[PDB]
């Protein structure tokens, strides 16, 4: 172990949790950014599995009778493992074909169906050139996955082809149904020829959103929806049942909440008779989880049915973990298998989490268990209630923008989850303080830093509302670390919807404290300009009186042809508080330098004609030399190399630059033999990044990453030698998701570390050896 | 400028905001109590316009191609302005005919349709004798509004005739539709002959609540409702669309919240093809604002549609202002015009407010902007969150009952908005503290005063729940002004639903502190009697221990034939704390006087046989004389003059009265030439008032106002001369809404002022010159 994770567990949208039918307590989890995790203790702890070509996983299936053979459906196609998920290989027939369901023929594990699909991730189906519209197809293997046949069930190239489920008749293994936006289809020869099943009301709601079939094969359950381009605005899915011997649908929503996106129904494999247990959650909607009971008679008539919430709002009966997400959005839900020694239970989620319910057949009760985070003995106070801090169970799937550390305190600023805070060095966390009174949540935190309020170390943060990275505005908050404990509180200083302190509403893509005067804080409001808090102690003095001290505007950026309009990273000068650098990503791009004059006025100018949306600049001092380091595209004549991002270095504050790292350097230090995905999607890979470069003392770090495909090439550490040259080494090591949004060199407990945040796998740190620092 | 407003902005139900099609950023706002406001900076600041005959405005329309010609639909009929709204004239054809929609024929601004209507104000359609039932009619002008024709489209005199919208075919200017409770009607000759369009289900929901028509004229959108007498209990309006070439409705509510009063749909004038953007809010219901997208093909089939919330609950993305009204009730919503240089945007409201959204066509995003209030640098704490105080943007539409002032602190007690508090002398305000824990809001505050708690000035208030003036109970609250800052808090002392301190549930129509002993507070519980807090400092001592000190009943009013049962205003004696006066408005009416005896008992008796629901009495001392002043109807033989309200004065505590002001006096001091409305509705005007009389030193003030028609005659100031006579002068000046609920003479910063609250336009103050006071 080299890279050390510091996360509270999970935190990203979970696609599925799949049980191994051959052995109780063995489960796999499909993440949308880090691939597949495995557990052999029913989710008490999770371990990463082998490397996939694409990490956006929609389906995992374990071969009945062979736990070593596992199939994984990803956005780029099907993978097969023959060593129990230790290693994976892309299946050539399905390359560039997103797969989201995998089903085995009952009694013949060599007969497999893998169906094109992508769950609700319509936003991502085009990342590799696919479209939602196309012929309706499935892939069928009859030799256990060595070869696959392409079967067409609909030939309309202009209609949505997403398949949501494939389900076999347990009582007649050659009968199989599929549920698709194309409709529900049936095959009586194992999936080689299909016929369409008419829906309950195809003129109005033709799209199927999942089917279920009773084990005796006699009853089909389905939900149906109107045709609309985006699930965001398609809210009412209705639930129906029909006998399969004569298609005649009846609506069976009596007892369900109205106007919900019910999907992926599923019959308990234990329902072998005329009473069927049907598990029903939904995409997006938060209502917990339903179990329905349908009592048919032997005439094929439904005597009665009833839906029961077996999971509901937070009420004290289950540990919600750190992710206070109530009611649960049960975006997947499965009964446990009847094989392998499994007990009867339910696997589900609150959306970003993993939950397992055990079942009491005496009183038909469910007991929900947190399978993503572990509470510690530390407590935080919020809503007048005490909540534990939580340490991860082995997974981490958060989009983390930035990180700051002071003594025992760590904060990572995340998308979706906002202010993620730790008071034990990053072992356990809580983000409860981001849920503010008045009904708004500080769910997007793009920058954090540590300032100085009259000698008291004070966290500063760009913290605003908005999910999925859709930050609403620039908004500056501060937390005085009086106790380095959960008792410390956040207060708002500037920005927000109310334009507090005269700070405009443009997002502060970075907030930076001056190392020379840590009371002074710089921030760049997107499309407005660069602003400054001269002394944060004075700003808090006004705040404590119920007043507000205005911020100072030091640069105006409102002209696209002449001004820098957006900044990604601000680098104050390490020793001169009247000089700052920033990387401009809007208007006139590149590294900009500003200098304050005696009358307090500033002059700004471009010092490197670079570009790139996530371009960074860093300035530090080491043994008498001030280094200026740019990670970006371009640079001008003699430096630009197409759209390749490069590391450029200057020792004279940006008047002269030297190219010290390129993609060719990266490939020589870390050959493409190290990348499982090079042969298949290397022709698409672009040498860019999400950020994550840093410099301190004699060390420099960077990471090549292409967010278009969630592909990370590697992490590279450079050592500045006594003569000026930089020698580079590969420090990727065991970091499996290596793209980086930010990196900082941080000394903790007398040892120098590299703290790095990732756009999908949270926070990691790594020991750095042989480092020299200036005494500071 | 003479009268100075002190308000946080808006605060009353907004009827519409209408853009000028000829010039970007010029807008008009229809208020229901002060007429029409105009802005030329897209709502950053608002200015009043000319005087209307009736101030309840339902519609405003700007003549295309002539920004100086403006039409205004009011409860009393149509007004026309030819000088850009600087002055108005009533249109004789529509006198006494409430108008709520005005539409111009495309390409011919001389062809105008004005439709009878009154939006949702069914409570007010009878104020001037009209009824909702009657023939369905529209007014049509073909010469730009010099003359109007009355067109009948339905002749049933017993069915509701409200028209909600009139919409032309942009592609065929002679085709026009209207949407009415009578149904949807169509004309193919510019509105001179109409035919009925059958609704989707006329046996069940025949009433139309607004229509929209695509610019190409091919698709009609509408919402339809069951026939019910009151919108309060009619909650489910369904949305439909039909091709206009063959009426065949289809329901299109998929994606909308169920059971909502969707109304006034509107197609973007930019939707010139087969994809239509439809804007949809509702009356009363709070869900934000929907934009729908309808994609038709050239066969006249709807391929798909989807509804998107472009405005939703308070989440941090927009400034809610001082009126924490979430989710928004978008009771009107309009796209900006395509002419005049307008950008694409949306004008709407949270109910009592004005909001504008700018639009980003790159990502189809909306950015909502507060266009009714302006945040300051002062903050208040509520819900554990910091909220700014807000100063008005130029409008004020609150029903304000009463006002109190102490040093920098001001409170106006309002209906709907409750405890409206200021800490900068009335510039900026916040009412957040009226939203109490446990889910009740102190939204009705009919009386406020300043008491003395052991030397600490302490606000006292009748503050209870209930909207629209429907106060639930009598309930006494107190705020110790320890800091004269938002840190001071309200505590409950007596009354309420729980009968605290033995105070009954009758509303305390007035609360009055004794000027001789400002620790002693009087209050009159409607239909129970008169009660007293002997020493409020002692009451708060019990309260701070978690206990309650009982109030003292000093007068029992439970006999309609012998007792005073309801009081409107209490006037404690200025120097003798054992004497109080009050104006009785229930049971035996008139000015009553009570005197406390040595054993603590009180004797009460009627001293002036006056009457009137809003009758007032004031007692003050000046240069050795105690003045008692009554503003009321009646008085007895030699004083009564029909139902005319008069000012009566007594210098011997009510044993002898002299008449010092009458309507004839008012008309001689302020001739009817000063009133735009005298010729049209002067025959209805009654010389009454809502209150607003006061006396202090050598000055007396009163205001004649008839709430039945929202007509204010004028404000009159009287000077008590050295010989006893009173000389009166007209001080209406620039006060456009001059009816008054309360007036107080208040010295602020060494200058004497008159603070006056109005039943619809908030709080105003005016410098008073040449005033003499007793040193107090
Ligand atoms: Cl049903
Ligand atoms: Cl529908
Ligand atoms: Zn997804
Ligand atoms: Zn940062
Ligand atoms: Zn109204
Ligand atoms: Zn009062």
TrEMBL record, chains A, B:
Binding sites annotated in the UniProt record for Zn(2+) 1: 13, 121
Sorted UniProt keywords: Metal-binding, Repeat, Signal, Zinc
Part of the full-length chain shown: 21 to 796 of 1428
Taxonomic lineage of the native organism: Bacteria, Pseudomonadati, Pseudomonadota, Gammaproteobacteria, Cellvibrionales
Binding site for Zn(2+) 2: 402, 510
Binding, Zn(2+) 3: 541
Residues that, per the record, bind Zn(2+) 4: 556, 559, 563
Gene Ontology MF term list: metal ion binding
Protein name stated in the entry: Fibronectin type III domain-containing protein
């Amino acid at each position: 172990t080299v890279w050390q994770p510091l996360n509270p567990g999970a935190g990203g949208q979970v696609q599925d949790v799949v049980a191994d039918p051959n052995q109780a307590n063995v489960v796999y989890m499909a993440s949308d950014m880090e691939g597949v995790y495995k557990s052999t203790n029913n989710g008490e702890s999770w371990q990463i599995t082998g490397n996939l070509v694409n990490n956006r996983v929609f389906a995992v299936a374990v071969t009945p009778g062979n736990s070593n053979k596992i199939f994984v459906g990803t956005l780029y196609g099907l993978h097969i493992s023959t060593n129990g998920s230790n290693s994976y290989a892309l299946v050539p027939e399905t390359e560039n074909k997103s797969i989201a369901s995998i089903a085995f023929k009952p009694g013949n594990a060599n007969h497999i169906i893998a169906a094109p699909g992508w769950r609700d991730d319509d936003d991502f189906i085009g990342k590799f050139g696919e479209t939602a519209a196309g012929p309706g197809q499935v892939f069928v293997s009859q030799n256990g996955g060595s070869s696959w046949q392409t079967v067409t069930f609909d030939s309309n190239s202009s209609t949505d082809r997403n398949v949501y489920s494939v389900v076999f008749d347990q009582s007649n293994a050659n009968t199989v149904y599929l549920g698709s936006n194309k409709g529900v289809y049936k095959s009586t020869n194992g999936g080689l020829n299909w016929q369409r099943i008419a829906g309950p009301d195809d003129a109005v709601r033709p799209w199927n959103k999942g089917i279920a079939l009773s084990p005796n094969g006699q009853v089909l359950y389905a939900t149906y929806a109107e045709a609309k381009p985006d699930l965001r605005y398609n809210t009412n899915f209705l639930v129906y049942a029909t006998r399969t011997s004569n298609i005649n649908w009846q609506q069976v929503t009596g007892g369900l909440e109205g106007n919900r996106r019910y999907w992926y129904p599923e019959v308990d494999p234990r329902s072998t008779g005329n009473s069927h247990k049907v598990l029903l959650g939904a995409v997006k909607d938060r209502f917990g989880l339903y179990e329905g009971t349908f009592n048919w008679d032997n005439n094929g008539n439904l005597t009665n049915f009833y839906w029961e919430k077996i999971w509901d709002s937070y009420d004290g009966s289950w540990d919600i973990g750190w992710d206070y997400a109530t009611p649960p959005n049960a975006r997947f839900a499965h009964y446990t298998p009847v094989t392998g020694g499994w007990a009867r239970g339910v696997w589900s989620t609150t959306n970003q989490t993993m939950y397992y319910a055990s079942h009491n057949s005496g009183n038909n009760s469910y007991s929900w268990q947190n399978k993503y985070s572990t509470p510690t003995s530390q407590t935080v106070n919020w809503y007048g209630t005490e909540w534990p801090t939580y340490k991860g169970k082995g997974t981490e799937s958060t989009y983390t923008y930035d990180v700051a550390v002071h003594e025992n305190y760590v904060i990572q600023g995340q998308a979706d989850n906002g202010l993620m805070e730790s008071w034990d060095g990053g072992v356990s966390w809580s983000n409860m303080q981001h849920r503010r009174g008045g009904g708004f949540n500080l769910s997007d935190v793009q920058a954090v830093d540590i300032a100085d309020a009259w000698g008291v170390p004070t966290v500063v943060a760009q913290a605003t509302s908005g999910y999925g990275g859709g930050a609403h505005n620039g908004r500056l908050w501060a937390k005085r670390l009086n106790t380095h404990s959960p008792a410390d509180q956040w207060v708002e200083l500037a920005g927000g919807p109310n334009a507090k302190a005269g700070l405009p509403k443009g997002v502060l893509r970075d907030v930076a404290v001056s190392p020379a005067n840590p009371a002074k804080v710089f921030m760049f409001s997107s499309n407005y300009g660069m602003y400054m808090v001269e002394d944060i102690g004075r700003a808090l003095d006004y705040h404590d009186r119920g007043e507000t001290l205005p911020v100072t505007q030091i640069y105006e950026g409102l002209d696209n042809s002449n001004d820098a309009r957006i900044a990604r990273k601000i680098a104050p000068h390490p020793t001169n508080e009247k000089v700052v650098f920033f990387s401009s990503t809007g208007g006139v791009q590149g590294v900009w330098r500003g200098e304050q004059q005696n009358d307090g006025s500033w002059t700004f100018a471009q010092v490197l004609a670079s570009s790139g949306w996530d371009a960074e600049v860093e300035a530090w001092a080491y043994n008498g030399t001030v280094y200026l380091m740019s990670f970006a595209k371009g640079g001008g004549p003699g430096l630009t190399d197409g759209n390749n991002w490069q590391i450029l270095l200057s020792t004279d504050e940006g008047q002269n630059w030297q190219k010290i790292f390129t993609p060719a350097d990266a490939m020589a230090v870390r050959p493409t033999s190290n990348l499982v995905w090079w042969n298949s999607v290397g022709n698409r890979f672009k040498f860019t990044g999400k950020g994550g470069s840093a410099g301190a003392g004699n060390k420099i770090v960077m990471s090549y990453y292409d967010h278009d495909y969630q592909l990370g090439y590697g992490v590279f550490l450079g050592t500045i030698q006594s003569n000026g040259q930089v020698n580079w080494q590969d420090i990727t090591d065991d970091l499996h998701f290596s793209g980086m949004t930010s990196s900082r060199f941080i000394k903790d407990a007398g040892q120098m570390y590299l703290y790095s945040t990732t756009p999908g796998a949270g926070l990691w740190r790594r020991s750095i050896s042989g480092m020299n620092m200036d005494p500071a």
